[PDB]
Design an enzyme around this catalytic site. Structure first.
Site, PDB file in Angstrom:
ATOM      1  N   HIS A 166       0.815  -1.220   0.000  1.00  0.00           N
ATOM      2  CA  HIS A 166       0.000   0.000   0.000  1.00  0.00           C
ATOM      3  C   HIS A 166       0.857   1.283   0.000  1.00  0.00           C
ATOM      4  O   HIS A 166       0.318   2.383  -0.140  1.00  0.00           O
ATOM      5  CB  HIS A 166      -1.035  -0.012   1.137  1.00  0.00           C
ATOM      6  CG  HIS A 166      -0.501   0.413   2.471  1.00  0.00           C
ATOM      7  ND1 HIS A 166      -0.142  -0.489   3.449  1.00  0.00           N
ATOM      8  CD2 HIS A 166      -0.313   1.643   3.007  1.00  0.00           C
ATOM      9  CE1 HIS A 166       0.274   0.166   4.520  1.00  0.00           C
ATOM     10  NE2 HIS A 166       0.175   1.462   4.280  1.00  0.00           N
ATOM     11  N   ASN A 176      16.443  12.733  12.137  1.00  0.00           N
ATOM     12  CA  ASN A 176      15.558  13.842  11.798  1.00  0.00           C
ATOM     13  C   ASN A 176      15.382  13.903  10.285  1.00  0.00           C
ATOM     14  O   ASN A 176      16.330  14.197   9.551  1.00  0.00           O
ATOM     15  CB  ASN A 176      16.092  15.170  12.336  1.00  0.00           C
ATOM     16  CG  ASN A 176      15.067  16.281  12.239  1.00  0.00           C
ATOM     17  OD1 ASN A 176      14.391  16.426  11.220  1.00  0.00           O
ATOM     18  ND2 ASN A 176      14.934  17.069  13.309  1.00  0.00           N
ATOM     19  N   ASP A 194       0.170  -7.625   1.898  1.00  0.00           N
ATOM     20  CA  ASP A 194       0.622  -6.230   1.898  1.00  0.00           C
ATOM     21  C   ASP A 194       2.140  -6.138   2.034  1.00  0.00           C
ATOM     22  O   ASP A 194       2.682  -5.778   3.090  1.00  0.00           O
ATOM     23  CB  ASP A 194      -0.090  -5.437   2.997  1.00  0.00           C
ATOM     24  CG  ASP A 194       0.110  -3.935   2.872  1.00  0.00           C
ATOM     25  OD1 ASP A 194       0.615  -3.470   1.825  1.00  0.00           O
ATOM     26  OD2 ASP A 194      -0.260  -3.219   3.832  1.00  0.00           O
ATOM     27  N   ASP A 232       0.711   2.222  19.895  1.00  0.00           N
ATOM     28  CA  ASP A 232       0.410   1.659  18.577  1.00  0.00           C
ATOM     29  C   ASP A 232       1.248   2.333  17.489  1.00  0.00           C
ATOM     30  O   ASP A 232       1.855   3.379  17.720  1.00  0.00           O
ATOM     31  CB  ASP A 232      -1.078   1.891  18.276  1.00  0.00           C
ATOM     32  CG  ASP A 232      -1.672   0.888  17.282  1.00  0.00           C
ATOM     33  OD1 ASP A 232      -0.949   0.042  16.718  1.00  0.00           O
ATOM     34  OD2 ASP A 232      -2.899   0.970  17.064  1.00  0.00           O
ATOM     35  N   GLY A 258       1.687   7.114   8.590  1.00  0.00           N
ATOM     36  CA  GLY A 258       3.068   7.500   8.312  1.00  0.00           C
ATOM     37  C   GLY A 258       4.083   6.457   8.754  1.00  0.00           C
ATOM     38  O   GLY A 258       5.230   6.509   8.323  1.00  0.00           O
ATOM     39  N   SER A 296       3.390   3.313   8.122  1.00  0.00           N
ATOM     40  CA  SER A 296       3.149   2.369   7.026  1.00  0.00           C
ATOM     41  C   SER A 296       4.417   1.885   6.358  1.00  0.00           C
ATOM     42  O   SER A 296       5.256   2.693   5.968  1.00  0.00           O
ATOM     43  CB  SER A 296       2.301   3.038   5.943  1.00  0.00           C
ATOM     44  OG  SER A 296       0.955   3.116   6.335  1.00  0.00           O
ATOM     45  N   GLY A 297       4.540   0.568   6.219  1.00  0.00           N
ATOM     46  CA  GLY A 297       5.644  -0.035   5.488  1.00  0.00           C
ATOM     47  C   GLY A 297       6.879  -0.278   6.330  1.00  0.00           C
ATOM     48  O   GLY A 297       7.809  -0.936   5.883  1.00  0.00           O
TER      49      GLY A 297
END
Ligand SMILES: NCCc1c[nH]cn1
Ligand SMILES: [Ca+2]
Length: 223
Positions: free
Chosen positions: A40, A54, A84, A171, A175, A177-178
């Site tokens: 995704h 950073n 996924d 959790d 952002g 994601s992956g």
């Protein structure tokens, strides 16, 4: 990451940021030329950013390398998020060092109760929105298949697992994601989906990487 801690600069040396003008997803470096992320997270024009803390400041340990190709899993379903997972090849091999290092693939699947490290630059709020610039970390246990399925009726496939806390508060989030879920030095999960973030009885759901090791190895060997 909601309810986590500041990792410390370059303490998670396999963590990558995928950048298309801005950070949009995490990933994991698995060798000098290849990154694993979520399907995704697929888009064109990906630059892989390694050695980041950073993400808004050049601090001196970064390597920025454009992707030459992306390979989404052949069975990825974007509606159900089954399978996924995606591979990204770098245009040039990263220079591996103490701060830019690959993470090992699993040789076996990890069990419920296994303690893992989840990391990313995602939202740190469960209601509002605040994006950190530095990498955030969360220690979280893998949850039982039964509790995962009970949390998300009809949605958990054999290629997914839950990790985190049924009480909420801690959790992964938008952002992240992956990005990686690493347990005992092995990449066991990829940040995939959830229902909001850090909500009671709605733990994060992760791609079950151990199911994909053969695909990953064979794909790398021919691409
Ligand atoms: N546990 C939620 C992870 C996530 C992925 N995308 C958005 N949020
Ligand atoms: Ca930086």
């Amino acid at each position: 990451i909601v309810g986590g801690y500041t990792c410390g600069a370059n303490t998670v040396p396999y963590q990558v940021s995928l950048n298309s003008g801005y950070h949009f997803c995490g990933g994991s470096l698995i060798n000098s030329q290849w990154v694993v992320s979520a399907a995704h997270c697929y888009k064109s024009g990906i630059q892989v950013r390694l050695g980041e803390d950073n993400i808004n400041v050049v601090e001196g340990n970064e390597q920025f390398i454009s992707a030459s190709k992306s390979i989404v899993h052949p069975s990825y379903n974007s509606n159900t998020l089954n399978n996924d997972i995606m591979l990204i090849k770098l245009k040039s091999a990263a220079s591996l060092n103490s701060r830019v290092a690959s993470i090992s693939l699993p040789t076996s699947c990890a069990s419920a109760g296994t303690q893992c490290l989840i990391s990313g630059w995602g939202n740190t709020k469960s209601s509002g929105t605040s994006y950190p610039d530095v990498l955030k970390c969360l220690k979280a246990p893998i949850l039982s298949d039964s509790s995962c399925k009970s949390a998300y009726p009809g949605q958990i496939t054999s290629n997914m697992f839950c990790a985190g806390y049924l009480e909420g508060g801690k959790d992964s989030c938008q952002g992240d994601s992956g990005g990686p879920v690493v347990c005992s030095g092995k990449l066991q999960g990829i940040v995939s989906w959830g229902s909001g973030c850090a909500q009671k009885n709605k733990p994060g759901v992760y791609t079950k990487v151990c199911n994909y090791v053969s695909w990953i190895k064979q794909t790398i060997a021919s691409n």
